[PDB]
Symmetry: D2
């Protein structure tokens, strides 16, 4: 059982995923490739000795009858248009996070998806396939630590380039916690509040670090410290305090050395290494289900819409200096 | 070798009585005092300690043998006892908190200043815990750069029915209020108490509580207080600086591999956590005093600062708003 | 560039590797299969929905013109015959560990390999591909802890079936340490000694635990505790003390729980989980090199001979109660 | 209050002199003794202690004032001082080792039995370490079932030139020899010293060493000894039972994240590792005695066992074979 995939957007992760889908994920052949920049797509096909047809306009890729599944790794600005066109053409869609920046752009995709009467979209929030997050999820769902009450998270990264501004702390970075905490706790957010701790004097190009207080609808208190120029490495923390215990996300194992009065392990520096395995796992799940004839079971268009709205309210909080309210429609039955 | 009189032989009083007589060098207990008749003598008898008993503390203070006054009485007597000792020109070791109100702290401060000699230490013992001294030294060395964020936890297994919402601040968070300020060498400008969803296992107070405190330079401190966390007594203190993070250690435990689990022990009894630091704070206090030096632990000023801060905290519990911490200029006397 | 594989021996691990090779490893296609038990091979084909020629005699699998690579997952007793026949037919060989039980059988494969006059054999000692082992190796080789002097290892397993006898603690279990420590240290063994500590009163089917002292040629002292009915799970330790520090092998990351006065993480119980990833990584390296037109770079026929002779001395030490000497010829230049 | 005289005011002598006058309750130091002239008094001078200074320990022993003799003299002197003290009917706290030769241990045992009363404690202080006590409790509860294999490490950063190959046993491993025996409630039957490849940074002794010991019931004990490991002072002790493993903790340290490393401190100064066990072993001793109870620490018989086993280790270094530990029957005096 094997499925035909077209990829739109052969940028940084476009290539990566191109390599993945032809070489690592089973039940999928890449038959079509597409980038708006002239040499791009073919250049990657060349890199990997992959044979696909190459299209400059994504529309012809989606119209290509070979193409059964559309994979969206293009720039955010493009996401909604490509997704809508795929859904209107009755094709499945894996779309990288975020679904789209605006709530409204997420709504058009939801609308396109429902007209098919069939769940057909998964979003690339890969942390849900990370094995440690899966372990944490199961501890929560087992009831072992009882009802969750408080959550403490850290999302730390060694440094940023100058073009990463204050809003990207939310849009690019926090967005992961936005999605993963929601999934861990099976709750939405009612409020968000971005605090600005003392500015790092190493950092001149954005406000950093930041401290976000989020309340879920039942009142679970989430604190996430975000420090994207913490200097020492890439470091994810997630602790959940329930009524009768606490559960802690593990980190990446390292050999340990005793040397010169110090007992030490490594902390990762390259952010891409942290959830690198989950990319393959999330696609493998997606392709296993579609090939089994079942709907996707990962993050949905609705999950993408949720994240967008929550991220939006955090950014608003940055600007106004106030707690902001998260406003969301009823979860459509379609997504239940 | 200084001669001490302990005022108030209750739960902590008797332990301090045993401690000063047996574990601390450069001091001997010459008098004791409690308003519940028998109490003071019972403890004397229990530990086979010979001291002059006093029912009224004024006599204990006037006693020409008593050179140092240790205050282990109920919060209400603190300020009254402290003031008299200072007016008698005697040194004071007072258990935390300094006093019930900010104004009582002001009363001690003025009595201390009238002696024109720094003479009071407060029993905020965490500053003497070896793990906190290590964390402080790491912060001060510049290893992690300038601190910008702090995350703390003060967890306890369960509380009795009598423990009320304001006690989360007054009895429990008070320790963090003092230790964070000492760690960072700053004061607070704002406090905010958030109440996460209420634990179904607790009906006698609001629990847990999440406190967000800002220092004068904008350092952000988050502390989770969960006094019915069920699992034990657990203290966390992580400091994120500009280029590193420093983590307070916990109590070492032997580790076990069995039935598919690797585990260590978490403390249950809150009294065991900083037990060592009582002996250490006292040894320091008397080593300085015997050496002709002023006390160098928490000052009357530190206790006033903790009072004002706790108040804003309790006021935040009530109002649902961020509350401002309002302080007068620090008097040079405390510098 | 893709190579075609016949797999001889579709048993517990053969079915597993049949699956990985077909579905997980790129640059390989499985075109043929063989097992001695009627219908066993085809059952796994069916199980996994893979099309391959099914042969009853491995000779016919080897002689099959589509087979370029022979994967040997048969019973130990068959390894040498299969490997020799595959080399005799100028096909590459991947062979599960051990290469063979007897030195003389390892020699037969060595001879057949050298008759080809090129390096064609990898043995499935998968620990060398495990990420923690690779990391430990890099610390050693960088000189950070200085010259290695002493090593402490543990190979623990929760329990064994009655069929598992005293010699198997060496043949099945220690064989992994036999090979990996030699790789870590770049040395052979000059002597081995098996102590029998106090017998576990929970164990009546073999002598357990066992404690093994091995000396490398330069005098590096290696101690390995083997407890295959330790009850608590599957647990691998490896510590290297050098002249100026110590390096410790990591274990499997686990979420941690604070509950009822205990702070804890999980210990694995299923042995197959521990090095599960290293299977994929080992074949992926094997097939990449082969497709690059390069010789395999994993454990060689000589490494399989080394492990055999050393295991034999350990078993001899079990029987005699004495330290036994490891007797080896000179490493052929062919294996350097 | 019991009255103590101390024989031998060297490194440890003067430290114990400080301990017994300062932080141990129920003991007064009334006499000291060192053979190097001025030595003893200089130490009394340092810590402002009033005490009678004797050149001859016989004199110290004959004081109407001295009830307890604390022996902190060179090993060579131990048996004579102890025999004499027990002869004059005085309690003995003796630092480890009891004596180096078994014959000298036997003389102390004979002296003690002639009193028909248990009177000697030995300063194997690890038994009072809080981590070893927890380890012991875990073993004894049955959590890990019957112990079968032990792995221990005794690492030290570096040694001075005067520290020789036999000292790896007599000074260093002696501690494991005693504490494994107490943990397991068992004696040894065989010992074997392996010599791994010699550290190139060590020219003055054979280092590291790897000791395989077998208890009477066949529990196998491996101890790695590395007294020039370079990195610090590091004690490891893992006990594998029938159904689990228990691990000695180490000294808790604050943790730092910085420059791509997560790290904690390893002690460098060997004296800091069990520093608390000294106060505790003495507090136990004097408590027991003050309550009219026999000492409950390591006995003369434990010192005898340590000596015989160490001897066999040193004999194994020399001969390169496994050596047998030959033990007589434990007298009932010591049960
Ligand atoms: N951890 C993760 O899930 C992960 C990591 C990084 C990026 N992403 C997401 O993946 C997406 C791609 O990011 P990137 O970092 O690879 O960016 P990129 O700029 O490197 O790649 C974007 C590519 O899309 C192409 N493109 C834009 N519009 C197109 C259109 N109309 N038709 C065809 N191609 C078009 C661009 O030419 C470019 O090659 C982003 O949406 C990003 O948020 C996800
Ligand atoms: N970790 C710590 O630093 C710590 C721990 C426990 C208690 N404390 C503090 O120690 C103080 C005593 O607490 P406790 O738990 O022992 O309380 P307690 O109630 O057991 O003891 C107080 C005693 O003082 C006596 N007393 C009250 N007023 C007096 C007066 N006018 N004159 C003489 N005696 C008087 C009471 O009769 C009582 O016996 C409190 O301030 C408390 O906050 C600090
Ligand atoms: N971690 C590891 O690398 C690892 C793990 C398990 C097994 N192994 C090894 O892999 C090999 C197979 O082990 P297993 O547990 O799958 O054994 P198994 O008994 O489950 O399978 C062996 C199979 O080979 C077949 N066989 C025997 N002779 C044959 C022949 N002449 N032609 C075709 N098939 C023949 C048998 O019919 C049997 O099905 C062994 O060498 C074992 O040591 C390695
Ligand atoms: N961790 C421990 O339990 C520990 C640590 C250090 C030393 N020790 C033991 O403590 C003892 C003393 O050790 P140290 O390092 O202080 O050595 P040291 O050499 O500094 O002290 C020995 C002292 O005793 C004196 N002395 C020798 N013979 C004497 C005699 N006949 N009469 C009176 N005094 C005599 C010496 O002059 C010297 O002052 C040793 O037995 C040693 O093994 C134990
Ligand atoms: K906005």
């Amino acid at each position: 059982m094997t499925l035909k995939a077209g990829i739109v957007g052969i940028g940084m992760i476009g290539s990566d995923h191109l390599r993945r889908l032809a070489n690592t994920v089973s039940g999928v052949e890449v038959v079509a490739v597409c980038d708006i920049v002239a040499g791009r797509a073919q250049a990657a096909l060349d890199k990997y000795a992959i044979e696909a047809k190459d299209y400059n306009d994504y529309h012809d890729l989606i119209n290509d009858k070979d193409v059964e599944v559309v994979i969206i790794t293009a720039s955010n600005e493009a996401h909604a248009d490509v997704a809508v066109a795929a859904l209107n053409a009755n094709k499945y869609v894996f779309c990288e996070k975020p679904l789209a920046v605006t709530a409204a752009d997420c709504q058009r995709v939801i609308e396109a998806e429902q007209k098919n009467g069939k769940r057909m979209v998964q979003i690339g929030f890969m942390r849900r396939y990370d094995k440690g997050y899966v372990q944490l999820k199961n501890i929560i769902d087992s009831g072992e630590i009882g009802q969750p009450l408080m959550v403490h998270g850290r999302h730390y990264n060694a440094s940023t380039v100058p073009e990463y501004k204050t809003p990207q702390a939310i849009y690019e970075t926090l967005i992961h916690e936005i999605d993963v905490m929601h999934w861990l706790l099976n709750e939405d957010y009612k409020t968000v509040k971005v605090y600005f701790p003392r500015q790092s004097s190493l950092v001149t190009t954005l406000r950093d670090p930041q401290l976000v207080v989020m309340e879920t609808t039942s009142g679970i208190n989430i604190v996430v410290e975000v420090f994207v120029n913490c200097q020492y490495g890439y470091d994810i923390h997630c602790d959940v305090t329930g009524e009768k215990g606490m559960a802690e996300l593990p980190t990446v194992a390292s050999a340990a050395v005793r040397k010169a009065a110090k007992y030490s392990t490594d902390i990762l520096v390259d952010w891409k290494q942290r959830f690198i395995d989950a990319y393959d796992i999330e696609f493998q799940d997606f392709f296993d289900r579609l090939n089994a004839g079942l709907p996707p079971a990962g993050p949905t268009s609705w999950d993408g819409y949720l994240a967008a709205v929550t991220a939006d309210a955090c950014v608003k909080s940055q600007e106004t200096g106030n707690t902001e309210i998260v406003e969301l429609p009823s979860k459509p039955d379609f997504y239940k």
